[PDB]
């Protein structure tokens, strides 16, 4: 599923990501745009051989099991394929652990490099939220 911008904002806020660990909703929408272009089916191999999955490009080296990643920890106790569902619940729940890991949203390098320090509220402007 390719979500619309305000569609994803509403889904993210219903699951409680707005101001989660102090990150306003625009941060999460900005991150999703640049990680996945709002596409739940997005997958991208990383150099280290792991793969990033889903709307928030959650990594198989530490968070989910994809059966092919040397050193996998599967801290969200989920198959990575479950992160590709049209329902973003599994992704949100695992992202809540990632953002609690100590580095905040810097865990998403796209957020650090393309959202941090920008007007991220722009990503929810116009959304009936």
Active centre residues (catalytic):
35, 52
For residues 57 and 39, give the distance between their C-alpha atoms in angstroms, rounded to a whole number.
10
Nearer to Na ion, 45 or 68 (CB): 45
Q: Is 42 in the site for Na ion (CB under 5 A)?
A: yes
Cβ 52 to Na ion, closest distance in Å?
9
- Give me the helix-helix angle, 5-14 and 25-36, nearest 10°: 130
Binding footprint of Na ion, residue count (CB under 5 A): 1
For residues 69 and 10, give the distance between their C-alpha atoms in angstroms, rounded to a whole number.
33
Q: Is 17 in the site for Na ion (CB under 5 A)?
A: no
φ, ψ for residue 64 (rounded to 5)?
-140, 165
Cβ 99 to Na ion, closest distance in Å?
11
Which residues make up each annotated binding site for substrate? 101
Q: Which residues bind Na ion (CB under 5 A)?
A: 42
């Amino acid at each position: 599923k390719v979500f619309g911008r305000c569609e994803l904002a509403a889904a993210m806020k219903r699951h409680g990501l707005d101001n989660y660990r102090g990150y306003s909703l625009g941060n999460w929408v900005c991150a999703a745009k640049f990680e996945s272009n709002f596409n739940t089916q997005a997958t991208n191999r990383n150099t280290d051989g792991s793969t990033d999955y889903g709307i928030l490009q959650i990594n198989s080296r530490w968070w989910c099991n994809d059966g092919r990643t040397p050193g996998s920890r599967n801290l969200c106790n989920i198959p990575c394929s479950a992160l590709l569902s049209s329902d973003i619940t599994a992704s949100v729940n695992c992202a809540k652990k990632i953002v609690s890991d100590g580095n905040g949203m810097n865990a998403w390098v796209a957020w650090r490099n393309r959202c941090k320090g920008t007007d991220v509220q722009a990503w929810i402007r116009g959304c009936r939220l």
